[PDB]
Paper text:
Negative staining images of MreCPa lacking the TM region and the first 21 residues of its N-terminal helix (MreCPa(36-330)) revealed organized bundles that associated into tube-like structures, some measuring several hundred nanometers. 2D class averages showed an ordered internal structure, allowing the determination of the helical parameters. Subsequent three-dimensional (3D) helical reconstruction of the MreCPa tubular assemblies showed that they are made of six sets of filaments consisting of two protofilaments organized in antiparallel fashion (green and cyan in Fig. 1e, f, 2a), with the core being formed by direct interactions between the ‘butterfly’ domains of laterally associated MreC subunits. The structure presents a 6-start helical arrangement with a 10.35 Å rise and 5.7145 (x2) MreCPa subunits per turn. The final 3D reconstruction exhibits a global resolution of 3.5 Å; the central ‘butterfly wings’ are the most stable part of the tube-like structure while the initial section of the N-terminal helix is poorly defined in the cryo-EM map. Fitting the refined crystallographic model of MreCPa(97-258) into the cryo-EM map confirmed that within each protofilament, monomers are ordered in a polar, head-to-tail fashion, with the β-sandwich folds contributing with complementing charged regions towards formation of the interface between two protofilaments. Three main regions are involved in filament formation: Pro114/Phe115 (Region 1) and Glu188/Arg190 (Region 3), implicated in lateral interactions between the antiparallel protofilaments, and Arg175 (Region 2), involved in longitudinal (head-to-tail) packing within each protofilament. MreCPa-Region2 was unable to self-associate into any kind of protofilament or higher order oligomer as indicated both by the lack of fibrous structures in EM and the low s values in SV-AUC (3.3 s, fitted f/f0 = 1.6).
Author numbering:
A (entry chain C), B (entry chain D), C (entry chain B), D (entry chain A): 79 to 254
């Protein structure tokens, strides 16, 4: 049951193993807090494996977050969906720039600084822009779920859904 | 023209000078970045005046933010509306607890962790809860502007309007 | 003819000699370029009189500009209406903040960074805010002449008329 | 997703790679401030690449600005839309001369010194004139969006829209 599931997930990772242009360490999600909102997880790679603080973490469908602390053989990763996390993004098709902030909900981000009149709609893909010099650019982050316009305010309300699996992830990739 | 305006504002501060239960230093807003979104300001009090990092800052109508760096005679204050700022709050009437995050818009906060079914509505007052042990409790923070409910997601979307003046403030109070 | 005119203007200056809260040097406008758009003038005070680069210059009705270069007994002053000049201001009544830029026209300024929905109207007085730490705050700068709203853009177009006389000024005051 | 987008943008640059008459360095936009009004950006070329202070910067559709400071491998570029920036221009068809100033809005310039009666209309193309000896002449700058005439004042109000992408740009060209 674990050997099947692990194989399926591993294959998916091999199919998306060409999405990177560098060396990536295949680490597994191991320590997780029981509460289903704890937007921070642990990985089965650490210092011995060359993992460092700040390192980006992704899966076969999206950027997941960043390492925020390292142990000899394990490490802690803050997910994009944490209220404390922000990532610069852009709408894939047109290059419209924004900041995606965590909401504390496992399945939602919110985009900041999107003009109320901006060309953005449900289903548009957001990808990393790299503009904070933390993440490689071009990797999928989320898809727009909703736009809410607001009378008198400069910026629209934009809710999005991460493309990575967050809570339902198995194995994770660390970028060098 | 400055003597009139300054007097009006000062009076308002004297009328709300009984809202505190301790000693408060009356400081003025002095250095501000030209850009009208820079959610961070400076004050005309500093180290010489006993101002410290972390100190809460408010006006006659709301909590404004916190000191984040000190100079001999001036200081820098991060406002609640900054994307990096979060404050624990509660709905005044019923005690429903939430986290108010800055949106980067001068006139808006967003509440996190509010159950989709929660008893919250447009016009409800949010006040500090003190639960992060950073702010005194009971001081006005914002009023709910909008609730948006979301199918399948645990938490509602709540937008609120700070009660303090943020960008349109003159003088500020520092709590000891 | 010059003794009458000079007396009238001097009196007006004596009536507005209580608008300052410090020592002010009464200097006259002396060297001016023939072209009626040259938004830069000279004054009959200089180094010998303690005039310095950066010093604010005003008349009985408004801030006029700043000294930009000093000579033994004369000095050059850049006016607010020069395209290269900007001054932080605020709407007197409500404290709405903005940047007033010179237009190159002797009788016009333009305000930057005023929300399209902002509470501003024809006849509102703008005064210095001091927020650039160059000018004393509270001194009259201009009155709003026109608001033009713009579909899709965040900021309104605001044209204003300086309260100082610019080209039709006689004598000028330098603030210490 | 980044490889597609980057290819499209690169092609567009190859199609407009004949607009220059000299050697141009293809640099990418890398460091950008989160705030969506910060009219200043960074490029992934610098001193090592022969980039210098003052150097003009453009894209496939317009002049973008100028380098204002150089680092070993990166550089900072001030955009035309910054309130501090001015560029001499001319109406393409008739040669009517003007100064285009930044407004602080990402999508707007304003023309100075345009006679109220001047032959200028919505949709006219403005191009660099070279007359400040900073920019090559003939390169597209903006298109007129609006003319507002003003009773008693010599100069019309002219708002224009840059042809370059400013905030929505990917890669940039530096002119030698």
């Amino acid at each position: 049951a674990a050997l099947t599931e692990q194989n399926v997930r591993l294959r998916e990772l091999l199919n998306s193993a060409a999405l990177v242009d560098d060396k990536v360490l295949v680490s597994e999600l191991i320590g997780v807090d029981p509460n289903p909102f704890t937007q921070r997880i642990m990985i089965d790679k650490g210092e011995n494996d060359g993992v460092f603080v700040g390192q980006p973490v992704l899966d076969a469908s999206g950027l997941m977050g960043q390492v925020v602390e390292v142990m000899p053989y394990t490490a802690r990763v803050l997910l994009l969906t944490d209220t404390t996390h922000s990532i610069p993004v852009q709408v894939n098709r047109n290059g419209l720039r924004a900041i995606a902030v965590g909401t504390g909900n496992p399945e939602r981000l919110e985009l900041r600084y999107v003009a109320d009149t901006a060309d953005i709609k449900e289903g548009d893909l957001l990808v990393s822009s790299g503009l904070g010099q933390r993440f490689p650019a071009g990797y999928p982050v989320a898809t727009v779920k909703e736009v809410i316009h607001d009378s008198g305010q400069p910026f629209a309300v934009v809710r999005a859904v991460p493309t990575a699996k967050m809570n339902r992830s198995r194995y994770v990739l660390l970028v060098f």
